[PDB]
Short mmCIF file of C-alpha atoms and ligand atoms in Angstrom, two decimals:
data_model
loop_
_atom_site.label_atom_id
_atom_site.label_comp_id
_atom_site.label_asym_id
_atom_site.label_seq_id
_atom_site.Cartn_x
_atom_site.Cartn_y
_atom_site.Cartn_z
CA UNK A 9 -1.90 -12.09 4.65
CA UNK A 10 -4.73 -12.26 2.62
CA UNK A 11 -6.71 -11.19 -0.63
CA UNK A 12 -10.35 -9.64 -0.34
CA UNK A 13 -12.81 -11.50 -2.54
CA UNK A 14 -15.28 -9.03 -4.52
CA UNK A 15 -18.60 -10.02 -5.88
CA UNK A 16 -19.85 -8.76 -9.50
CA UNK A 17 -20.63 -5.05 -7.79
CA UNK A 18 -17.19 -4.48 -5.60
CA UNK A 19 -18.57 -5.52 -2.51
CA UNK A 20 -16.54 -7.67 -0.33
CA UNK A 21 -17.63 -11.43 0.56
CA UNK A 22 -15.10 -12.87 2.16
CA UNK A 23 -10.87 -13.79 1.75
CA UNK A 24 -8.53 -15.99 0.64
CA UNK A 25 -5.15 -16.77 1.72
CA UNK A 26 -2.84 -14.73 -0.53
CA UNK A 27 -0.62 -17.27 -2.04
CA UNK A 28 -3.56 -19.92 -2.31
CA UNK A 29 -5.63 -17.41 -4.43
CA UNK A 30 -3.49 -16.86 -7.26
CA UNK A 31 -4.05 -20.12 -9.44
CA UNK A 32 -4.69 -20.83 -13.00
CA UNK A 33 -8.85 -20.12 -11.81
CA UNK A 34 -8.01 -16.81 -9.81
CA UNK A 35 -11.20 -15.38 -8.47
CA UNK A 36 -11.89 -11.83 -8.51
CA UNK A 37 -10.21 -9.84 -5.65
CA UNK A 38 -9.02 -6.18 -4.32
CA UNK A 39 -5.64 -4.79 -5.23
CA UNK A 40 -3.54 -1.85 -5.61
CA UNK A 41 -1.11 -0.50 -8.27
CA UNK A 42 1.11 2.16 -7.29
CA UNK A 43 3.97 4.60 -9.31
CA UNK A 44 6.55 6.07 -7.63
CA UNK A 45 8.93 9.12 -8.52
CA UNK A 46 11.61 10.57 -6.60
CA UNK A 47 12.53 14.38 -5.83
CA UNK A 48 14.02 15.03 -8.93
CA UNK A 49 10.99 13.32 -11.10
CA UNK A 50 12.24 9.88 -11.98
CA UNK A 51 10.10 6.87 -12.19
CA UNK A 52 11.01 3.69 -10.07
CA UNK A 53 10.81 0.48 -12.45
CA UNK A 54 11.23 -2.74 -10.57
CA UNK A 55 11.91 -6.12 -11.87
CA UNK A 56 9.34 -8.65 -9.74
CA UNK A 57 11.57 -11.47 -8.32
CA UNK A 58 11.89 -14.88 -9.72
CA UNK A 59 10.11 -16.13 -6.92
CA UNK A 60 6.87 -14.38 -7.26
CA UNK A 61 4.00 -16.54 -7.96
CA UNK A 62 2.50 -14.36 -10.77
CA UNK A 63 4.65 -12.44 -13.28
CA UNK A 64 8.05 -13.80 -11.85
CA UNK A 65 11.06 -11.62 -13.07
CA UNK A 66 8.91 -9.12 -14.96
CA UNK A 67 9.46 -5.77 -15.53
CA UNK A 68 6.44 -3.38 -14.05
CA UNK A 69 5.60 -0.40 -12.26
CA UNK A 70 6.99 0.64 -8.48
CA UNK A 71 4.63 -1.61 -6.10
CA UNK A 72 1.62 -3.55 -6.35
CA UNK A 73 -0.08 -5.49 -3.56
CA UNK A 74 -3.46 -6.55 -1.71
CA UNK A 75 -5.39 -4.20 0.93
CA UNK A 76 -6.27 -6.27 3.92
CA UNK A 77 -10.08 -6.20 5.31
CA UNK A 78 -10.53 -2.76 7.11
CA UNK A 79 -7.17 -1.24 5.35
CA UNK A 80 -7.33 1.83 3.51
CA UNK A 81 -5.79 1.70 -0.26
CA UNK A 82 -3.39 4.21 0.71
CA UNK A 83 -2.31 2.52 4.10
CA UNK A 84 -1.79 -0.69 1.92
CA UNK A 85 0.29 1.27 -0.43
CA UNK A 86 2.43 2.49 2.30
CA UNK A 87 2.58 -0.77 3.87
CA UNK A 88 3.95 -2.45 0.57
CA UNK A 89 6.60 0.52 -0.40
CA UNK A 90 7.91 -0.14 3.25
CA UNK A 91 7.92 -4.12 2.93
CA UNK A 92 8.93 -4.55 -0.60
CA UNK A 93 11.07 -1.55 -0.86
CA UNK A 94 11.75 0.14 2.49
CA UNK A 95 11.17 3.37 1.60
CA UNK A 96 8.99 6.30 3.07
CA UNK A 97 6.57 8.29 0.32
CA UNK A 98 4.29 11.15 0.31
CA UNK A 99 0.46 10.31 0.93
CA UNK A 100 -0.52 8.37 -2.04
CA UNK A 101 -2.44 10.13 -4.89
CA UNK A 102 -5.18 8.65 -7.06
CA UNK A 103 -4.48 8.62 -10.88
CA UNK A 104 -6.58 5.96 -12.07
CA UNK A 105 -9.39 4.96 -9.48
CA UNK A 106 -11.49 2.50 -11.79
CA UNK A 107 -9.04 0.27 -13.26
CA UNK A 108 -10.05 -3.46 -13.15
CA UNK A 109 -8.47 -6.10 -15.29
CA UNK A 110 -7.81 -9.78 -15.81
CA UNK A 111 -4.75 -11.45 -17.20
CA UNK A 112 -2.69 -14.90 -17.50
CA UNK A 113 1.19 -14.89 -17.10
CA UNK A 114 3.31 -17.14 -19.17
CA UNK A 115 2.95 -20.22 -16.87
CA UNK A 116 -0.85 -19.56 -16.69
CA UNK A 117 -1.03 -17.79 -13.29
CA UNK A 118 -4.10 -15.31 -13.31
CA UNK A 119 -4.59 -11.81 -11.83
CA UNK A 120 -8.20 -10.74 -11.69
CA UNK A 121 -8.04 -7.54 -9.92
CA UNK A 122 -10.18 -4.31 -8.95
CA UNK A 123 -6.87 -2.43 -8.99
CA UNK A 124 -7.02 1.10 -8.35
CA UNK A 125 -3.76 2.86 -9.36
CA UNK A 126 -1.93 6.04 -7.25
CA UNK A 127 1.10 8.06 -7.52
CA UNK A 128 3.61 8.91 -4.81
CA UNK A 129 7.11 10.86 -4.23
CA UNK A 130 9.73 8.63 -2.10
CA UNK A 131 11.06 10.75 0.68
CA UNK A 132 13.91 8.22 1.84
CA UNK A 133 16.45 6.02 0.19
CA UNK A 134 15.37 2.35 -1.14
CA UNK A 135 16.21 -0.65 0.99
CA UNK A 136 15.74 -3.49 -1.44
CA UNK A 137 13.54 -6.68 -0.12
CA UNK A 138 15.12 -9.21 -2.75
CA UNK A 139 11.94 -11.53 -2.29
CA UNK A 140 10.01 -9.13 -3.66
CA UNK A 141 12.51 -7.43 -6.08
CA UNK A 142 15.11 -8.93 -8.44
CA UNK A 143 16.17 -5.42 -10.21
CA UNK A 144 15.17 -1.96 -10.45
CA UNK A 145 15.80 1.06 -12.79
CA UNK A 146 15.26 5.02 -11.97
CA UNK A 147 14.26 6.25 -15.60
CA UNK A 148 12.56 9.29 -17.03
CA UNK A 149 8.98 8.83 -17.21
CA UNK A 150 8.94 9.67 -20.97
CA UNK A 151 11.62 7.04 -21.69
CA UNK A 152 9.06 4.43 -19.92
CA UNK A 153 6.00 5.19 -21.90
CA UNK A 154 8.08 5.15 -25.12
CA UNK A 155 9.17 1.57 -24.37
CA UNK A 156 5.72 0.68 -23.11
CA UNK A 157 4.37 2.00 -26.65
CA UNK A 158 6.70 0.32 -28.29
CA UNK A 159 7.24 -3.29 -27.02
CA UNK A 160 4.43 -3.71 -24.69
CA UNK A 161 5.32 -7.39 -24.22
CA UNK A 162 8.58 -6.38 -22.20
CA UNK A 163 6.58 -5.04 -19.51
CA UNK A 164 3.98 -6.39 -17.21
CA UNK A 165 0.27 -6.22 -18.69
CA UNK A 166 -1.06 -4.14 -16.21
CA UNK A 167 1.48 -1.57 -16.07
CA UNK A 168 0.61 -1.24 -20.39
CA UNK A 169 -3.15 -0.72 -19.60
CA UNK A 170 -2.42 1.72 -16.85
CA UNK A 171 0.15 3.75 -18.65
CA UNK A 172 -2.07 3.63 -21.75
CA UNK A 173 -5.48 5.07 -20.35
CA UNK A 174 -5.16 8.95 -21.40
CA UNK A 175 -6.02 10.12 -17.96
CA UNK A 176 -3.68 8.30 -16.25
CA UNK A 177 -1.18 8.91 -18.61
CA UNK A 178 -1.74 12.95 -17.97
CA UNK A 179 -1.80 12.42 -14.16
CA UNK A 180 1.48 10.20 -14.09
CA UNK A 181 3.06 13.09 -16.24
CA UNK A 182 2.70 15.66 -13.70
CA UNK A 183 4.82 13.70 -11.06
CA UNK A 184 7.80 14.62 -13.41
CA UNK B 13 27.02 -31.02 -23.64
CA UNK B 14 29.92 -28.82 -23.58
CA UNK B 15 31.22 -25.34 -24.50
CA UNK B 16 34.59 -25.19 -26.70
CA UNK B 17 37.39 -22.90 -24.55
CA UNK B 18 38.88 -20.11 -26.27
CA UNK B 19 42.32 -18.42 -25.10
CA UNK B 20 43.36 -14.88 -24.97
CA UNK B 21 43.30 -14.93 -28.71
CA UNK B 22 40.35 -16.44 -29.92
CA UNK B 23 41.84 -19.92 -30.37
CA UNK B 24 40.16 -22.83 -28.75
CA UNK B 25 42.03 -24.98 -26.19
CA UNK B 26 39.59 -27.81 -25.34
CA UNK B 27 35.96 -28.27 -23.91
CA UNK B 28 34.33 -27.83 -20.41
CA UNK B 29 30.88 -29.35 -19.55
CA UNK B 30 28.13 -26.66 -20.18
CA UNK B 31 26.35 -26.19 -16.73
CA UNK B 32 29.83 -26.27 -14.79
CA UNK B 33 31.47 -23.77 -17.23
CA UNK B 34 29.10 -20.91 -16.60
CA UNK B 35 29.93 -19.60 -12.90
CA UNK B 36 30.95 -16.47 -11.37
CA UNK B 37 34.62 -17.49 -12.92
CA UNK B 38 33.31 -18.07 -16.70
CA UNK B 39 35.90 -18.59 -19.17
CA UNK B 40 35.94 -17.18 -22.59
CA UNK B 41 34.33 -19.61 -24.99
CA UNK B 42 32.36 -20.05 -28.19
CA UNK B 43 28.84 -19.02 -28.65
CA UNK B 44 26.43 -18.10 -31.37
CA UNK B 45 23.53 -15.55 -31.07
CA UNK B 46 20.59 -15.61 -33.65
CA UNK B 47 18.22 -13.42 -34.99
CA UNK B 48 15.02 -15.25 -36.84
CA UNK B 49 12.28 -13.87 -39.08
CA UNK B 50 9.27 -14.94 -40.62
CA UNK B 51 8.02 -14.49 -44.74
CA UNK B 52 6.14 -11.35 -43.53
CA UNK B 53 9.75 -9.78 -42.27
CA UNK B 54 8.54 -10.00 -38.45
CA UNK B 55 11.44 -10.29 -35.61
CA UNK B 56 10.67 -13.02 -33.20
CA UNK B 57 11.94 -12.11 -29.72
CA UNK B 58 12.01 -14.64 -27.30
CA UNK B 59 11.80 -14.57 -23.51
CA UNK B 60 14.13 -16.90 -21.57
CA UNK B 61 12.93 -19.41 -19.22
CA UNK B 62 12.93 -18.99 -15.75
CA UNK B 63 15.17 -22.49 -15.24
CA UNK B 64 17.91 -20.94 -17.64
CA UNK B 65 20.99 -20.63 -15.60
CA UNK B 66 21.92 -17.02 -16.81
CA UNK B 67 19.49 -14.17 -17.24
CA UNK B 68 16.50 -16.58 -16.68
CA UNK B 69 13.02 -14.80 -17.34
CA UNK B 70 14.80 -12.17 -19.75
CA UNK B 71 13.42 -10.90 -22.92
CA UNK B 72 16.11 -11.03 -25.78
CA UNK B 73 16.47 -12.04 -29.42
CA UNK B 74 15.78 -15.27 -31.33
CA UNK B 75 17.95 -18.08 -30.12
CA UNK B 76 21.38 -18.17 -28.60
CA UNK B 77 23.72 -21.17 -27.71
CA UNK B 78 26.88 -23.07 -27.79
CA UNK B 79 28.60 -24.94 -30.46
CA UNK B 80 29.66 -28.56 -29.96
CA UNK B 81 32.91 -30.07 -30.82
CA UNK B 82 33.08 -30.69 -34.68
CA UNK B 83 30.10 -28.57 -34.98
CA UNK B 84 29.96 -25.45 -37.63
CA UNK B 85 28.36 -22.68 -35.82
CA UNK B 86 25.76 -22.62 -38.47
CA UNK B 87 24.70 -26.11 -37.61
CA UNK B 88 24.61 -25.35 -33.97
CA UNK B 89 22.46 -22.35 -35.00
CA UNK B 90 20.21 -25.05 -37.18
CA UNK B 91 20.37 -27.38 -33.99
CA UNK B 92 19.30 -24.72 -31.34
CA UNK B 93 16.54 -23.28 -33.47
CA UNK B 94 15.05 -27.19 -33.43
CA UNK B 95 15.62 -27.51 -30.03
CA UNK B 96 14.54 -24.12 -28.37
CA UNK B 97 11.63 -23.39 -31.08
CA UNK B 98 11.14 -26.52 -33.08
CA UNK B 99 11.75 -24.18 -36.09
CA UNK B 100 13.26 -24.72 -39.52
CA UNK B 101 15.19 -21.97 -40.74
CA UNK B 102 16.83 -20.75 -44.10
CA UNK B 103 20.92 -20.97 -44.41
CA UNK B 104 22.17 -18.63 -41.66
CA UNK B 105 23.53 -15.20 -42.48
CA UNK B 106 26.32 -14.09 -40.73
CA UNK B 107 25.66 -10.39 -39.47
CA UNK B 108 28.44 -9.49 -36.85
CA UNK B 109 31.18 -12.05 -37.06
CA UNK B 110 33.31 -10.32 -34.45
CA UNK B 111 31.00 -9.66 -31.61
CA UNK B 112 32.60 -10.60 -28.46
CA UNK B 113 30.98 -9.83 -24.82
CA UNK B 114 31.44 -10.17 -21.10
CA UNK B 115 28.48 -9.68 -18.78
CA UNK B 116 27.43 -10.77 -15.40
CA UNK B 117 23.63 -11.53 -15.01
CA UNK B 118 21.54 -10.72 -12.00
CA UNK B 119 22.48 -13.86 -10.19
CA UNK B 120 26.08 -13.20 -10.51
CA UNK B 121 26.48 -15.91 -13.25
CA UNK B 122 28.96 -14.62 -16.02
CA UNK B 123 29.08 -15.05 -19.65
CA UNK B 124 32.05 -14.83 -21.47
CA UNK B 125 31.76 -15.49 -24.99
CA UNK B 126 33.36 -14.88 -28.52
CA UNK B 127 29.82 -14.79 -30.28
CA UNK B 128 29.23 -14.26 -33.95
CA UNK B 129 25.60 -13.13 -34.87
CA UNK B 130 23.61 -14.70 -37.66
CA UNK B 131 20.38 -13.93 -39.05
CA UNK B 132 17.96 -16.67 -40.76
CA UNK B 133 14.05 -16.92 -42.10
CA UNK B 134 11.74 -19.63 -40.57
CA UNK B 135 10.40 -21.88 -42.78
CA UNK B 136 8.13 -23.91 -40.62
CA UNK B 137 5.74 -22.99 -37.63
CA UNK B 138 6.83 -22.87 -33.94
CA UNK B 139 6.92 -25.83 -31.49
CA UNK B 140 8.39 -23.90 -28.50
CA UNK B 141 10.18 -25.84 -25.94
CA UNK B 142 9.12 -24.59 -22.52
CA UNK B 143 12.31 -25.94 -20.94
CA UNK B 144 13.80 -23.09 -22.70
CA UNK B 145 11.50 -20.16 -23.86
CA UNK B 146 8.40 -19.27 -21.57
CA UNK B 147 7.10 -16.49 -24.00
CA UNK B 148 7.67 -15.11 -27.32
CA UNK B 149 6.23 -12.58 -29.79
CA UNK B 150 6.23 -11.81 -33.09
CA UNK B 151 7.30 -8.01 -33.74
CA UNK B 152 8.07 -5.22 -36.37
CA UNK B 153 12.21 -4.54 -35.95
CA UNK B 154 11.30 -1.04 -35.96
CA UNK B 155 9.46 -1.64 -32.92
CA UNK B 156 11.76 -3.64 -31.11
CA UNK B 157 14.77 -1.00 -31.74
CA UNK B 158 12.70 1.96 -30.15
CA UNK B 159 12.35 -0.02 -26.95
CA UNK B 160 15.76 -0.93 -27.03
CA UNK B 161 16.59 2.85 -27.36
CA UNK B 162 14.20 3.79 -24.71
CA UNK B 163 14.60 1.42 -22.02
CA UNK B 164 17.52 -0.97 -23.01
CA UNK B 165 17.75 -2.13 -19.27
CA UNK B 166 14.51 -4.35 -19.75
CA UNK B 167 16.43 -6.63 -22.38
CA UNK B 168 19.46 -8.98 -22.32
CA UNK B 169 22.37 -6.65 -22.79
CA UNK B 170 23.78 -9.04 -25.35
CA UNK B 171 20.64 -8.45 -27.49
CA UNK B 172 21.19 -4.70 -27.11
CA UNK B 173 25.12 -4.90 -27.80
CA UNK B 174 24.30 -6.61 -31.19
CA UNK B 175 21.02 -4.44 -32.03
CA UNK B 176 23.14 -1.02 -31.91
CA UNK B 177 26.02 -2.23 -33.89
CA UNK B 178 25.53 -0.33 -37.10
CA UNK B 179 26.45 -2.76 -39.83
CA UNK B 180 24.61 -5.56 -37.93
CA UNK B 181 21.38 -3.45 -37.73
CA UNK B 182 21.42 -3.01 -41.72
CA UNK B 183 21.30 -6.58 -41.88
CA UNK B 184 18.44 -7.17 -39.51
CA UNK B 185 16.48 -4.31 -41.59
CA UNK B 186 17.31 -6.46 -44.72
CA UNK B 187 15.65 -9.23 -43.07
CA UNK B 188 12.23 -7.27 -42.93
CA UNK B 189 11.53 -7.43 -46.32
CA UNK B 190 8.25 -9.77 -47.04
CA UNK B 191 9.36 -12.93 -48.99
CA UNK B 192 6.99 -15.47 -50.30
MG1 MG C 228 3.98 -6.40 -4.65
MG1 MG C 229 19.71 -20.94 -25.80
MN1 MN C 230 -3.75 -10.86 -7.19
MN1 MN C 231 27.94 -19.32 -22.48
#
């Protein structure tokens, strides 16, 4: 697996192996984030495995990943929902297309990404990949937003930035 | 380094080396938990290091640990505040002395403890020990309590159990006063 390097404009200029790409000095690259809801309207929140290179052990939205060369953002979402969560989903819908951020995790590992955000509904049961996810919770979206607003430090910085974008929050609120 | 083993009633019977004591089958033993506030009345929340045997990488209250043989619980608080956080404190106040709990962590490691709870003020700057603590934040107690109520699963279960005890919570609230 690789990540796709982006120039100042969002143009792909090459690739790097995925593990080697994320360092104290991570360069700008393409990613996605997704929020998954079940048929009941509950939000799936996940806790990243302790083996993840970046933000291990952190509570975050449902599934995040790195599209490969030639892959649509939506196909990447579907791919990592299968890979991390063993779950089938409805066609991903855009909720924050221009999100981009840079942040540094407690051990100094950086994420530096153009990261469009999506939402979808699960259409099967989860089957957890414990190399990716160490814990998870189905919850009411209102409660998760209350937690992000009171104690944002308890959640990943990109989950917070997404959830505190006024429009993204309105659009997420429609899946419940 | 060890733990003090306790029998079915709260009475000590001996010691056990600490790493070895915490397994899937942990026997009841003595511990403490502490909530630390700075002069402004902010609460220190901390994130356990990824190397901790139990609840690694988990957000929790300020400092927790295990008194050693010959140590008062209050001296254990002082010592672990120095070791984990590098910080000096005012005399720890007992705010939940009969707290006792048993819990399994995400890996299956069990904590089984008689765990009196304290609160204190810090009187020096921090010198965080990264072998024990991987992140921290100074917070308004009101906000922490709101987060615990909205998403309790995102924090250590012992922090949540202590915070929702009415009596202990009133003492926490008393420490949010600004003190010069
Ligand atoms: Mg991922
Ligand atoms: Mg400790
Ligand atoms: Mn990345
Ligand atoms: Mn213990």
